[PDB]
Design an enzyme around this catalytic site. Structure first.
Site, PDB file in Angstrom:
ATOM      1  N   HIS A  84       0.833  -1.215   0.000  1.00  0.00           N
ATOM      2  CA  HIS A  84       0.000   0.000   0.000  1.00  0.00           C
ATOM      3  C   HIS A  84       0.861   1.257   0.000  1.00  0.00           C
ATOM      4  O   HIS A  84       0.335   2.344  -0.284  1.00  0.00           O
ATOM      5  CB  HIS A  84      -1.008  -0.001   1.157  1.00  0.00           C
ATOM      6  CG  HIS A  84      -0.445   0.328   2.518  1.00  0.00           C
ATOM      7  ND1 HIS A  84      -0.129  -0.640   3.447  1.00  0.00           N
ATOM      8  CD2 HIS A  84      -0.255   1.509   3.136  1.00  0.00           C
ATOM      9  CE1 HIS A  84       0.308  -0.070   4.550  1.00  0.00           C
ATOM     10  NE2 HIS A  84       0.222   1.248   4.399  1.00  0.00           N
TER      11      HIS A  84
ATOM     12  N   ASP B 167      -0.125  -7.567   1.504  1.00  0.00           N
ATOM     13  CA  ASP B 167       0.308  -6.200   1.524  1.00  0.00           C
ATOM     14  C   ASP B 167       1.824  -6.092   1.616  1.00  0.00           C
ATOM     15  O   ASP B 167       2.346  -5.257   2.365  1.00  0.00           O
ATOM     16  CB  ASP B 167      -0.351  -5.438   2.690  1.00  0.00           C
ATOM     17  CG  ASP B 167      -0.215  -3.935   2.569  1.00  0.00           C
ATOM     18  OD1 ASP B 167       0.074  -3.388   1.453  1.00  0.00           O
ATOM     19  OD2 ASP B 167      -0.434  -3.259   3.624  1.00  0.00           O
TER      20      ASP B 167
ATOM     21  N   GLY C  67       2.961   6.494   8.851  1.00  0.00           N
ATOM     22  CA  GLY C  67       4.240   6.566   8.168  1.00  0.00           C
ATOM     23  C   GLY C  67       5.219   5.507   8.615  1.00  0.00           C
ATOM     24  O   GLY C  67       6.408   5.563   8.230  1.00  0.00           O
TER      25      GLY C  67
ATOM     26  N   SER D 181       4.436   2.014   8.523  1.00  0.00           N
ATOM     27  CA  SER D 181       4.278   0.750   7.841  1.00  0.00           C
ATOM     28  C   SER D 181       5.581   0.401   7.175  1.00  0.00           C
ATOM     29  O   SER D 181       6.337   1.268   6.717  1.00  0.00           O
ATOM     30  CB  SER D 181       3.144   0.782   6.818  1.00  0.00           C
ATOM     31  OG  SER D 181       3.412   1.631   5.721  1.00  0.00           O
TER      32      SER D 181
HETATM   33  C1  LIG Z   1      -1.336   4.237  11.157  1.00  0.00           C
HETATM   34  C2  LIG Z   1      -0.328   3.542  10.627  1.00  0.00           C
HETATM   35  C3  LIG Z   1      -0.600   2.216   9.872  1.00  0.00           C
HETATM   36  C4  LIG Z   1       0.572   1.309   9.556  1.00  0.00           C
HETATM   37  C5  LIG Z   1      -0.078   2.126   8.418  1.00  0.00           C
HETATM   38  N1  LIG Z   1      -0.917   1.329   7.557  1.00  0.00           N
HETATM   39  C6  LIG Z   1      -2.170   1.775   7.104  1.00  0.00           C
HETATM   40  O1  LIG Z   1      -2.475   2.949   7.238  1.00  0.00           O
HETATM   41  C7  LIG Z   1      -2.971   0.761   6.401  1.00  0.00           C
HETATM   42  C8  LIG Z   1      -3.253   0.875   4.926  1.00  0.00           C
HETATM   43  C9  LIG Z   1      -4.504   0.446   4.745  1.00  0.00           C
HETATM   44  O2  LIG Z   1      -4.755  -0.964   5.000  1.00  0.00           O
HETATM   45  C10 LIG Z   1      -4.449  -1.807   3.964  1.00  0.00           C
HETATM   46  N2  LIG Z   1      -4.290  -1.271   2.659  1.00  0.00           N
HETATM   47  C11 LIG Z   1      -3.944  -2.178   1.631  1.00  0.00           C
HETATM   48  C12 LIG Z   1      -3.744  -1.607   0.238  1.00  0.00           C
HETATM   49  C13 LIG Z   1      -3.363  -2.622  -0.848  1.00  0.00           C
HETATM   50  O3  LIG Z   1      -3.209  -2.187  -2.141  1.00  0.00           O
HETATM   51  C14 LIG Z   1      -3.395  -0.792  -2.282  1.00  0.00           C
HETATM   52  C15 LIG Z   1      -3.165  -4.078  -0.577  1.00  0.00           C
HETATM   53  C16 LIG Z   1      -3.369  -4.618   0.790  1.00  0.00           C
HETATM   54  C17 LIG Z   1      -3.782  -3.639   1.890  1.00  0.00           C
HETATM   55  N3  LIG Z   1      -3.950  -4.160   3.208  1.00  0.00           N
HETATM   56  C18 LIG Z   1      -4.305  -3.259   4.244  1.00  0.00           C
HETATM   57  C19 LIG Z   1      -4.528  -3.767   5.655  1.00  0.00           C
HETATM   58  C20 LIG Z   1      -5.868  -4.482   5.595  1.00  0.00           C
HETATM   59  C21 LIG Z   1      -3.393  -4.686   6.037  1.00  0.00           C
HETATM   60  C22 LIG Z   1      -5.317   1.089   5.963  1.00  0.00           C
HETATM   61  N4  LIG Z   1      -4.390   0.921   7.002  1.00  0.00           N
HETATM   62  C23 LIG Z   1      -4.621   0.932   8.414  1.00  0.00           C
HETATM   63  O4  LIG Z   1      -3.642   0.759   9.160  1.00  0.00           O
HETATM   64  C24 LIG Z   1      -6.057   1.116   8.874  1.00  0.00           C
HETATM   65  N5  LIG Z   1      -6.335   0.093   9.800  1.00  0.00           N
HETATM   66  C25 LIG Z   1      -6.863  -1.129   9.310  1.00  0.00           C
HETATM   67  O5  LIG Z   1      -7.179  -1.319   8.155  1.00  0.00           O
HETATM   68  O6  LIG Z   1      -6.993  -2.082  10.302  1.00  0.00           O
HETATM   69  C26 LIG Z   1      -7.550  -3.323   9.714  1.00  0.00           C
HETATM   70  C27 LIG Z   1      -8.333  -3.930  10.623  1.00  0.00           C
HETATM   71  C28 LIG Z   1      -7.178  -4.384  11.726  1.00  0.00           C
HETATM   72  C29 LIG Z   1      -6.095  -4.829  10.979  1.00  0.00           C
HETATM   73  C30 LIG Z   1      -6.371  -4.346   9.497  1.00  0.00           C
HETATM   74  C31 LIG Z   1      -6.214   2.510   9.485  1.00  0.00           C
HETATM   75  C32 LIG Z   1      -5.386   2.656  10.780  1.00  0.00           C
HETATM   76  C33 LIG Z   1      -7.729   2.642   9.784  1.00  0.00           C
HETATM   77  C34 LIG Z   1      -5.775   3.611   8.509  1.00  0.00           C
HETATM   78  C35 LIG Z   1       0.816   3.192   7.929  1.00  0.00           C
HETATM   79  O7  LIG Z   1       1.607   3.757   8.598  1.00  0.00           O
HETATM   80  N6  LIG Z   1       0.650   3.407   6.545  1.00  0.00           N
HETATM   81  S1  LIG Z   1       1.584   4.601   5.941  1.00  0.00           S
HETATM   82  O8  LIG Z   1       3.038   4.505   6.069  1.00  0.00           O
HETATM   83  O9  LIG Z   1       1.146   5.865   6.582  1.00  0.00           O
HETATM   84  C36 LIG Z   1       1.109   4.817   4.242  1.00  0.00           C
HETATM   85  C37 LIG Z   1      -0.407   5.048   3.974  1.00  0.00           C
HETATM   86  C38 LIG Z   1       2.164   5.574   3.463  1.00  0.00           C
HETATM   87  C39 LIG Z   1       1.942   4.078   3.239  1.00  0.00           C
END
Ligand SMILES: C=C[C@@H]1C[C@]1(NC(=O)[C@@H]1C[C@@H](Oc2nc3cc(OC)ccc3nc2C(C)C)CN1C(=O)[C@@H](NC(=O)OC1CCCC1)C(C)(C)C)C(=O)NS(=O)(=O)C1(C)CC1
Ligand SMILES: [Zn+2]
Length: 200
Positions: free
Chosen positions: A78, A102, A158, A160
């Site tokens: 993601h 992911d 930020g 992940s």
């Molecule tokens: C805050 C920091 C967290 C680490 C972080 N991650 C996210 O924000 C991820 C991305 C998305 O989820 C996904 N998107 C996907 C997209 C895809 O193809 C596009 C393929 C597979 C995917 N699989 C997932 C999950 C299902 C695994 C949403 N989300 C979440 O955490 C959400 N919570 C959640 O969904 O809880 C679910 C139920 C409990 C557990 C799972 C939330 C918190 C409500 C925003 C972060 O830091 N990201 S990031 O660096 O800022 C960034 C955006 C710059 C990169």
């Protein structure tokens, strides 16, 4: 678009800094500023020296982490999508891509160091964020762990692609998503290192 000659190309993921864990204090370091990141993303040519296990990476629109384990720099789909990573000799194609987990990975950059996959069977973990905060996490399942002290989602955004580590510093997992209630992260979802190894 129907006009192929003017279709654009996405840039590469770029290493812009690192989380320094080599001494007694964890701290973030920036190794490239926003402009030179932009240029490196378009060319795919990154001659900067890479050090350490946990990199801070960026695209044109996002910034997140990437973690070396077993000679592969791993991060989240993601964040990176299918993008190449910038490298001294030009763009490098992913060697692993799994949207269902992911998960993506590239060969680890020369100069990086890799974490060792954990075989301790221990549930007292530590999450490392992009701000070099070390967050104790109790493992609660195959892919979940609870924060001993919950934090707002903002604190984790930020991060992940960052590691969960065991008390000995082994890699247990790659942070993927936060488990959130009313904006407070009580738990995290992570890709277990065993899942990385099966993907390998
Ligand atoms: C805050 C920091 C967290 C680490 C972080 N991650 C996210 O924000 C991820 C991305 C998305 O989820 C996904 N998107 C996907 C997209 C895809 O193809 C596009 C393929 C597979 C995917 N699989 C997932 C999950 C299902 C695994 C949403 N989300 C979440 O955490 C959400 N919570 C959640 O969904 O809880 C679910 C139920 C409990 C557990 C799972 C939330 C918190 C409500 C925003 C972060 O830091 N990201 S990031 O660096 O800022 C960034 C955006 C710059 C990169
Ligand atoms: Zn261990």
């Amino acid at each position: 678009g129907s006009h192929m000659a003017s279709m654009k190309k996405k840039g590469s993921v770029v290493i812009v800094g690192r989380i320094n864990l080599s001494g007694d204090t964890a701290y973030a370091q920036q190794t490239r500023g926003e402009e030179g990141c932009q240029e490196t993303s378009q060319t795919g040519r990154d001659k900067n020296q890479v050090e350490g296990e946990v990199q801070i990476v960026s695209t044109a629109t996002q910034t997140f982490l990437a973690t070396s384990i077993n000679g592969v720099l791993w991060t989240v789909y993601h964040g990176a999508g299918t993008r190449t990573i910038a490298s001294p000799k030009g763009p490098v194609t992913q060697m692993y891509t799994n949207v269902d987990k992911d998960l993506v990975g590239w060969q680890a950059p020369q100069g990086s160091r890799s974490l060792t996959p954990c075989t301790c069977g221990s549930s007292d973990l530590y999450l490392v964020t992009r701000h070099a905060d070390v967050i104790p996490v109790r493992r609660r399942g195959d892919s979940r762990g609870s924060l001993l002290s919950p934090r707002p989602i903002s604190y984790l955004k930020g991060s992940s692609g960052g590691p969960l580590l065991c008390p000995a510093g082994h890699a247990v997992g790659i942070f993927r998503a936060a488990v959130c209630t009313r904006g407070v992260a009580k738990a995290v979802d992570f890709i277990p290192v065993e899942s990385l190894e099966t993907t390998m």
